[PDB]
Amino acid sequence: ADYQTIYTQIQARGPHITVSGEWGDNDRVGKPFYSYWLGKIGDAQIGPIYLGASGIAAFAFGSTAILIILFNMAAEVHFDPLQFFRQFFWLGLYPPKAQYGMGIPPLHDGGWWLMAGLFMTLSLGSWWIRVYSRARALGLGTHIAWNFAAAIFFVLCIGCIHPTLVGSWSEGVPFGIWPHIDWLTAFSIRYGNFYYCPWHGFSIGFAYGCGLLFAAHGATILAVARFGGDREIEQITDRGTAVERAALFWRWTIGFNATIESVHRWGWFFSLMVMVSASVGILLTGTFVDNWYLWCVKHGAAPDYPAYLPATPDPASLPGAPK
Amino acid sequence: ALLSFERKYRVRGGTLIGGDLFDFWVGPYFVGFFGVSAIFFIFLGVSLIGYAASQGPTWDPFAISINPPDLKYGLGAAPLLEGGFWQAITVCALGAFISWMLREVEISRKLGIGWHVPLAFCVPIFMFCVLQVFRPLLLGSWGHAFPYGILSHLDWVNNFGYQYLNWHYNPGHMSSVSFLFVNAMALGLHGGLILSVANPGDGDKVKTAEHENQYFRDVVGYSIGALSIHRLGLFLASNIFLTGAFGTIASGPFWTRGWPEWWGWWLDIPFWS
Amino acid sequence: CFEPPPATTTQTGFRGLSMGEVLHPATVKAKKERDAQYPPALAAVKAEGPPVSQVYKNVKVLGNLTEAEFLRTMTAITEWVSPQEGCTYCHDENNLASEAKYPYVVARRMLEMTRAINTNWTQHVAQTGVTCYTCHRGTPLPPYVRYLEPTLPLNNRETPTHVERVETRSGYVVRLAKYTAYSALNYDPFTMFLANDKRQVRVVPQTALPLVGVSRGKERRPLSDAYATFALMMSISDSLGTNCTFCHNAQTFESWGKKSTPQRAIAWWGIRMVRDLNMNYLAPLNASLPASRLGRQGEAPQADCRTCHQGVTKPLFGASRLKDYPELGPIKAA
Amino acid sequence: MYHGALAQHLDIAQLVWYAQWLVIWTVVLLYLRREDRREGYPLVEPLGLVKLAPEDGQVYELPYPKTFVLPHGGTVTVPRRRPETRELKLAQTDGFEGAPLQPTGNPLVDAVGPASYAERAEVVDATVDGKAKIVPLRVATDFSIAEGDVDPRGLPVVAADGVEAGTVTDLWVDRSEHYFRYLELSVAGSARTALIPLGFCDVKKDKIVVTSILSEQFANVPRLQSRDQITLREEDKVSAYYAGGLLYATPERAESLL
Ligand code: BCB
Ligand code: BCB
Ligand code: BCB
Ligand SMILES: C/C=C1/c2cc3[nH]c4c(c3C)C(=O)[C@H](C(=O)OC)c4c3nc(cc4[nH]c(cc(n2)[C@@H]1C)c(C(C)=O)c4C)[C@@H](C)[C@@H]3CCC(=O)OC/C=C(\C)CCC[C@H](C)CCC[C@H](C)CCCC(C)C
Ligand SMILES: C/C=C1/c2cc3[nH]c4c(c3C)C(=O)[C@H](C(=O)OC)c4c3nc(cc4[nH]c(cc(n2)[C@@H]1C)c(C(C)=O)c4C)[C@@H](C)[C@@H]3CCC(=O)OC/C=C(\C)CCC[C@H](C)CCC[C@H](C)CCCC(C)C
Ligand SMILES: CC(C)=CCC/C(C)=C/CC/C(C)=C\CC/C(C)=C/CC/C(C)=C/CC/C(C)=C/CC/C(C)=C/CC/C(C)=C/CC/C(C)=C/CC1=C(C)C(=O)c2ccccc2C1=O
Ligand code: HEC
Ligand code: HEC
Ligand SMILES: CC(C)=CCC/C(C)=C/C=C/C(C)=C/C=C/C(C)=C/C=C\C=C(C)\C=C\C=C(/C)CC/C=C(\C)CCCC(C)C
Numbered sequence A: 001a002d003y004q005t006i007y008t009q010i011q012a013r014g015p016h017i018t019v020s021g022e023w024g025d026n027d028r029v030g031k032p033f034y035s036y037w038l039g040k041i042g043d044a045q046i047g048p049i050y051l052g053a054s055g056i057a058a059f060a061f062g063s064t065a066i067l068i069i070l071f072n073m074a075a076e077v078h079f080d081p082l083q084f085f086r087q088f089f090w091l092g093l094y095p096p097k098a099q100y101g102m103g104i105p106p107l108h109d110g111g112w113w114l115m116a117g118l119f120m121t122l123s124l125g126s127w128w129i130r131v132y133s134r135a136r137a138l139g140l141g142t143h144i145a146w147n148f149a150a151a152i153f154f155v156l157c158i159g160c161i162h163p164t165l166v167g168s169w170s171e172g173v174p175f176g177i178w179p180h181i182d183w184l185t186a187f188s189i190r191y192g193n194f195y196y197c198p199w200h201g202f203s204i205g206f207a208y209g210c211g212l213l214f215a216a217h218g219a220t221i222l223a224v225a226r227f228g229g230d231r232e233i234e235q236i237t238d239r240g241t242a243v244e245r246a247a248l249f250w251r252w253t254i255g256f257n258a259t260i261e262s263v264h265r266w267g268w269f270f271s272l273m274v275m276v277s278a279s280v281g282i283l284l285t286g287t288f289v290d291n292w293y294l295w296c297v298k299h300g301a302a303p304d305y306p307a308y309l310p311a312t313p314d315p316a317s318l319p320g321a322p323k
Numbered sequence B: 001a002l003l004s005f006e007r008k009y010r011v012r013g014g015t016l017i018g019g020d021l022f023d024f025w026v027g028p029y030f031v032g033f034f035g036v037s038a039i040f041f042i043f044l045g046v047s048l049i050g051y052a053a054s055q056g057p058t059w060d061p062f063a064i065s066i067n068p069p070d071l072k073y074g075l076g077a078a079p080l081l082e083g084g085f086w087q088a089i090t091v092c093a094l095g096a097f098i099s100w101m102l103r104e105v106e107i108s109r110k111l112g113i114g115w116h117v118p119l120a121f122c123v124p125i126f127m128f129c130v131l132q133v134f135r136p137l138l139l140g141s142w143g144h145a146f147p148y149g150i151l152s153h154l155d156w157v158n159n160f161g162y163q164y165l166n167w168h169y170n171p172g173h174m175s176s177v178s179f180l181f182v183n184a185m186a187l188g189l190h191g192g193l194i195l196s197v198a199n200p201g202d203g204d205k206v207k208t209a210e211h212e213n214q215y216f217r218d219v220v221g222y223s224i225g226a227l228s229i230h231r232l233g234l235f236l237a238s239n240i241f242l243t244g245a246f247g248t249i250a251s252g253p254f255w256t257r258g259w260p261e262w263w264g265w266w267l268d269i270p271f272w273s
Numbered sequence C: 001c002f003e004p005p006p007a008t009t010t011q012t013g014f015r016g017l018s019m020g021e022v023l024h025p026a027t028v029k030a031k032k033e034r035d036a037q038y039p040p041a042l043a044a045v046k047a048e049g050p051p052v053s054q055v056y057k058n059v060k061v062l063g064n065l066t067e068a069e070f071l072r073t074m075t076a077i078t079e080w081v082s083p084q085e086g087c088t089y090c091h092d093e094n095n096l097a098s099e100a101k102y103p104y105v106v107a108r109r110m111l112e113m114t115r116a117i118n119t120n121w122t123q124h125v126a127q128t129g130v131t132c133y134t135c136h137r138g139t140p141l142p143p144y145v146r147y148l149e150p151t152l153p154l155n156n157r158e159t160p161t162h163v164e165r166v167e168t169r170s171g172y173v174v175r176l177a178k179y180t181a182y183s184a185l186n187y188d189p190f191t192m193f194l195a196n197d198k199r200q201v202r203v204v205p206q207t208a209l210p211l212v213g214v215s216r217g218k219e220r221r222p223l224s225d226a227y228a229t230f231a232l233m234m235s236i237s238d239s240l241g242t243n244c245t246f247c248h249n250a251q252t253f254e255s256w257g258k259k260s261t262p263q264r265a266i267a268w269w270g271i272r273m274v275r276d277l278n279m280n281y282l283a284p285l286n287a288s289l290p291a292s293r294l295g296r297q298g299e300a301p302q303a304d305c306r307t308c309h310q311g312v313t314k315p316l317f318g319a320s321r322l323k324d325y326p327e328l329g330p331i332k333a334a
Numbered sequence D: 001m002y003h004g005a006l007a008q009h010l011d012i013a014q015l016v017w018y019a020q021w022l023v024i025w026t027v028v029l030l031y032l033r034r035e036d037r038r039e040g041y042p043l044v045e046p047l048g049l050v051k052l053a054p055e056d057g058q059v060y061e062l063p064y065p066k067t068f069v070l071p072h073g074g075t076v077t078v079p080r081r082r083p084e085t086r087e088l089k090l091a092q093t094d095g096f097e098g099a100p101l102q103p104t105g106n107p108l109v110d111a112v113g114p115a116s117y118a119e120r121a122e123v124v125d126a127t128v129d130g131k132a133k134i135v136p137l138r139v140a141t142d143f144s145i146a147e148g149d150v151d152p153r154g155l156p157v158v159a160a161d162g163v164e165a166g167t168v169t170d171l172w173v174d175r176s177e178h179y180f181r182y183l184e185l186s187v188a189g190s191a192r193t194a195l196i197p198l199g200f201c202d203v204k205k206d207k208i209v210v211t212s213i214l215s216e217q218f219a220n221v222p223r224l225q226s227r228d229q230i231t232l233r234e235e236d237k238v239s240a241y242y243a244g245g246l247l248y249a250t251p252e253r254a255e256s257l258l
């Protein structure tokens, strides 16, 4: 076996590299340090990190959201520290329970949730500027920022665009470990089973597809590490036996193949489409479809099954039934 | 026809079984003994699905459903129209998948490359076995397995989850999901990074390994490196199922209550109750 | 941490839908042993002599019974409600007609309630029926009751920790969670859905597309309604020691016909029965109970599914005393 | 009325379904599958029938060429016509077009099958500031082996027959990635040096084990043009030689494993 594909047998140390960007070279802080154990499975060097205005702003906005959430969670256990620690996963900051439509809810019934959302959205946007700007500073394309933009848009769909489109803040995702999970079920129930939403299916197909492709691509590159396949940039500009063998493995297996550059396009596209699909699904939900299962029945797609125990009429529909 | 660089690689050898007998290509496809077995299992399985569907109520592709037996058949053979088709198809499916994996080994050997891809492919095959074979064996019936139907298999997933009240609180599920999400995110990051270096835009120069590392070191304070991101991706993807399998196997054989209540191990400690 | 195999499993839907019960043999056995404490029917007595409406002074419900039949009922009621305390729990030992002790008048109303369950709610209780034991299980305070705020322990025979106590505000989220099968759902489904008939449990639309005039802004039910129904369903599930598939095919929770089991319809009738019990029999008892029995808003303890079922899909695994004590119903009209 | 309902029994989500599939297939087929053909195309046909007459489909499946501007000068355009000139020391095992080929000589030396290399540029891979990227420690004097790891210099290299093939004299480090890629050894009984990729080395405290080739086969490892630098094509030649051994070190290795 190629032991290098499992871990680095003999680690190298040398002087730290710094690539100059168009701006911000003076905003790198930290002194790099090295972990021997990390170095077995990754680069041993940690830090330095770039500061800059957009990252500082992201931390300020994000910390403010985090503090609003934590302070409301703490109120939920009457500020008792032991109960806060115990009950943490069950605690949350909730959107309005009452229906105010699009009215700004009062602080005690959704207003703090809304504030936390705003500060979170500002944090995300601020981090996006960093991800975008840093690429431009280093003379790189902005592929990562466009992928991140789709992730952010999805979060905006579930946090505030869907709520605006149906006209109720009650529909937003709560902040909290278990509470944000509980929302998934409430939302799926309200909209007639998310398994029957085609865009849920598309998003899954792409997400599972990212599993397949990263397993396939990661494994492919390790399989050709003996030929320097991991040096992907110069394999793109000057095809080597590594990527000739990678391509032929696939061609011979599945009947077609990518190139070392284009496989990264497939992976970027699959990852982007998880979020684009999910977002379309959410934008259509409540707006244009009320019950996904019934929409599938209407269009002739839903499976049907025999009764196992006797079929059961709705008792509310029976003669003389109470309300 | 061949890729312009392909002919030099089209040598004899590398087989696991069969030697020269099946060591040849059909168009772009390598055959080998396991290509022959794959085709046999695919043909039989797909034929059986066609026949099973022809005996059911619909030809709609989303609605067709080929189902396992009633629980009462236990681990025995079921009549064809009462779960026996499902049993036969399952055997064909595993024969096809395993043949596919071993064919990839032969192809890897012929090319002189590592066997990492078929090893990675063992992971989804293993998960299929967890769902359809191991868990049903532990519960005592084939009828606990999932049905073959585009939408029907989702009805099974749905009910199985709700059998444990809220499957989201399953700790093996929580791990599996986290791996699914971080893997999708990482694939995006890795693809975009490589494309950003090779495609800076505007007649600018292609950048370098040093630029790749500098980008993440600047954005998050660490760069894992060019080889290691591939090891990481394989690890994250594989662990979607290597960790999820524990959550699947636990549900029924090792835990019969709702999943949220499992967390009582933490919530109900006397010190803070 | 875990439950050792084998699991008992049942099938409740078409093959390949993963519908059915999932049960731990040791838990089933412990619940059967608890429920097996139900005292046996007392020996039959010959009906002879006049009705006790003519023999006794203050009989208003069980007046048709003969003396021996009526004293058999009193013996049974004593076994089921106050065996530790005895006849004098309800009675002045020197005047059995006296209503001076508050349990006498409550007991008379409970006799009416039990007769009403067994006569008017056969759509739920069938010919299994209920006795005083079904709820009380040998104590004057039934072990599983609800107030207008969540309370812990669920079983009031267990000593509460300080944090479990309703006065300890820091414990509220846990009181809620342990009523909804450990979920974090931030709703009390007892006060929302079972204490009265004000709220609709159904939350899913009955058409594919959103109807214009109910689907925008303040026209809409808030999403909180769906979380609250989910909370009720977690609570019912845990109350009966079962899961969603005992009643539903999760393909479509909202559908009946082949998409629901006969148990779902029985559950529907149970919700109506429980609301009748609470609004019309149990809640009004706050005027007849001492302040020490009442919750913090002055409410009488009331019933939920668990009050009878106690973690079993049929209370007491389907044990019945209906033919043994016909005086508890069904009562022939009128 | 219903939100989303349109004329002719249609609804908005239903139209979006068709549109999403259209977008997916368009991107997959028209964009990605053509990006996939920037290397190796057009396909090569047996005998020839070459061109002469390039089929319409040979044009349709290709994207327009793209040009990379290289970091250290020059450009690279793909797809482009890339002849494979070098006569192959392979012969047909059978007349049918999918039959495999077999080596006519020593396949490690002739560089066929898994001993094949690509016609990479005969240029030294460069660091971001234009120094030679992959160099021995005798040149990269600011690099070192991490504390805790085996220093392989002086250790014997032990080949697949368990015979000692030579002695490790240096390590070659990638100065851009900070990562060792080759060991350099003096070859016993030959008067030469040879590189070996670390992926073919099992590094032990007392020896380097190499199962890919037999001891006698180290004599023909491809030789570098210069002592202290390596070209991208030489890297391909060196790695390919050891990979050849996996199939060809003994006659048994090409034959069925089981
Ligand atoms: C424990 C949970 C499970 C699960 C949960 C799940 C969910 C929740 C959803 C899917 C969805 C999908 N599932 Mg399922 N599923 C599928 C296949 C499928 C597809 C019909 C679809 C898209 C998958 C995709 O793109 O993946 C990544 C792979 C890619 C992109 C490569 C292409 C794969 C190709 C589309 C597979 C097509 C399969 C054929 C229709 C099957 C028949 C093959 C024969 C007859 C030729 C297979 C073949 C299996 C097997 C063999 O085990 C499987 C098991 C499971 N699924 C488990 C039971 N699946 C989604 C869907 O839309 O369902 C309708 C969806 O929402
Ligand atoms: C009972 C309920 C269920 C449910 C309900 C559900 C809902 C309601 C939704 C999904 C959605 C999705 N579901 Mg589904 N689902 C899925 C899979 C998936 C995902 C592929 C998909 C998109 C979500 C995503 O990637 O979020 C992970 C990624 C996120 C959230 C992006 C984050 C990006 C962000 C920039 C990160 C920022 C981090 C900052 C540091 C945070 C700062 C913090 C603050 C405090 C400062 C599977 C595979 C299954 C199976 C196997 O059964 C399943 C079953 C179910 N789902 C049930 C049917 N699902 C979504 C969808 O597609 O709808 C159509 C969706 O909205
Ligand atoms: C209401 C019920 C729910 C549910 C129930 C559920 C169950 C019951 C299970 C999962 C499982 C899983 N869930 Mg969950 N889930 C998931 C995510 C996931 C997955 C990460 C994970 C593993 C899936 C799997 O086994 O694939 C399996 C895929 C396989 C086996 C693919 C096999 C491929 C094969 C080898 C090759 C096939 C070839 C084709 C036939 C070829 C076709 C030919 C063509 C292409 C030429 C998300 C992200 C969400 C969200 C967002 O809410 C969600 C919600 C829900 N889950 C609900 C709460 N989930 C599983 C898990 O791990 O739980 C811990 C599981 O058992
Ligand atoms: C399908 C494609 C997907 C996808 C894609 C992409 N996702 C990206 C990018 C792309 C392309 C980026 O370019 C960007 C990034 O930079 O990557 C390195 C990023 C992000 N994805 C995050 C998390 C996440 N993605 C999820 C999902 C998906 N993503 C889906 C699956 C999920 C879940 C729930 O699934 C989670 C939790 C953060 C790590 C990060 C945003 C930080 C932020 O907006 O902070 C804003 C808030 C703060 C800076 C303050 C609070 C600090 C928090 C607690 C911690 C922040 C850590 C940060 C890295 C700081 C490090 C420096 C520190 C050591 C000193
Ligand atoms: C954790 C890591 C993961 C991972 C990894 C990897 N994945 C790989 C590889 C690696 C490394 C390969 O090397 C191999 C390959 O070549 O890739 C191009 C492969 C492949 N992953 C496939 C599908 C896939 N991967 C999924 C998941 C993951 N992949 C996870 C995420 C999922 C889902 C659902 O999630 C799906 C659907 C095929 C495209 C391909 C197998 C072809 C096959 O085996 O051919 C042989 C078999 C056939 C061509 C047809 C067989 C038909 C049978 C007999 C009859 C049908 C029976 C069936 C049971 C009916 C189901 C009905 C349905 C509605 C319920
Ligand atoms: C009843 C009936 C008629 C039954 C049918 C019987 C039948 C099947 C007959 C066929 C007989 C024939 C024709 C031939 C016999 C020989 C034989 C064994 C043939 C196999 C035929 C067969 C079963 C084909 C199916 C192949 C198959 C499973 C295809 C799936 C393709 C899919 C969906 C892939 C998903 C992953 C994905 C999105 C990939 C796209 C991107 C690619 C191509 C990545 C691969 C790839 C990666 C990952 C790199 O990292 C890389 C790095 C550097 C260079 C290149 C690559 C590269 O190409
Ligand atoms: C409360 C749970 C009771 C217990 C314990 C016992 N009895 Fe009772 N008793 C109860 C009620 C509600 C009534 C009136 C019933 C009605 O139909 O209105 C009675 C009545 C009697 C009487 C008749 C008294 C009279 O009117 O003269 C007798 C003789 C009687 N009960 C006896 C009795 C005995 C012997 C008990 C222990 C075995 C006993 N009762 C328990 C309520 C309760
Ligand atoms: C039988 C004892 C049940 C169990 C177990 C579960 N549910 Fe249920 N559900 C039941 C009934 C009788 C009703 C209707 C009540 C009424 O007064 O109309 C319901 C309703 C739902 C709904 C709403 C359906 C609608 O039409 O909008 C949902 C979403 C629902 N139930 C879900 C659900 C879940 C997730 C369960 C397990 C946690 C579950 N139910 C259990 C009866 C029974
Ligand atoms: C009128 C218009 C157009 C807009 C109104 C204003 C506006 C933009 C509102 C936006 C609201 C939004 C986007 C709401 C989104 C809410 C979402 C998606 C919440 C989702 C999940 C939250 C969870 C899991 C939070 C748990 C929080 C805690 C445990 C507290 C601390 C949190 C952390 C340290 C971060 C989690 C760690 C993670 C990286 C693993």
Ligand SMILES: CCCCCCCCCCCC[N+](C)(C)[O-]
Pocket: A029, A030, A031, A032, A033, A034, A035, A046, A047, A048, A049, B221
């Ligand atoms: C991320 C910027 C650098 C942070 C500086 C923090 C210095 C920590 C020094 C401890 C070194 C730990 N070490 C070397 C043993 O791994």
Ligand SMILES: CCCCCCCCCCCC[N+](C)(C)[O-]
Pocket: A023, A053, A054, A057, A121, A122, A123, A124, A125, A126, A129, A133
């Ligand atoms: C969501 C946006 C929030 C506004 C606050 C962020 C301001 C940071 C902008 C810094 C831009 C500096 N620059 C041009 C060098 O990248």
Ligand SMILES: CCCCCCCCCCCC[N+](C)(C)[O-]
Pocket: A195, A196, A197, A198, A199, A200, A201, A202, A296, A299, A300, A301, B060, B061, B062, D017
């Ligand atoms: C993930 C759920 C996917 C459900 C897909 C439903 C699509 C409905 C529209 C097309 C139906 C076509 N038809 C009649 C052939 O089934």
Ligand SMILES: CCCCCCCCCCCC[N+](C)(C)[O-]
Pocket: A201, A202, A205, A206, A209, A256, D024, D028, D029, D033
């Ligand atoms: C639901 C997710 C959709 C994923 C799309 C999958 C794309 C793989 C298609 C490969 C097509 C191969 N070929 C040679 C016919 O172009």
Ligand SMILES: CCCCCCCCCCCC[N+](C)(C)[O-]
Pocket: A254, A255, A256
């Ligand atoms: C919906 C995604 C499924 C795509 C099916 C994959 C296509 C199988 C084709 C194998 C060989 C393809 N081809 C024609 C390029 O050789």
Ligand SMILES: [Fe+2]
Pocket: A217, A221, A232, A264, B190, B194, B230
């Ligand atoms: Fe890569």
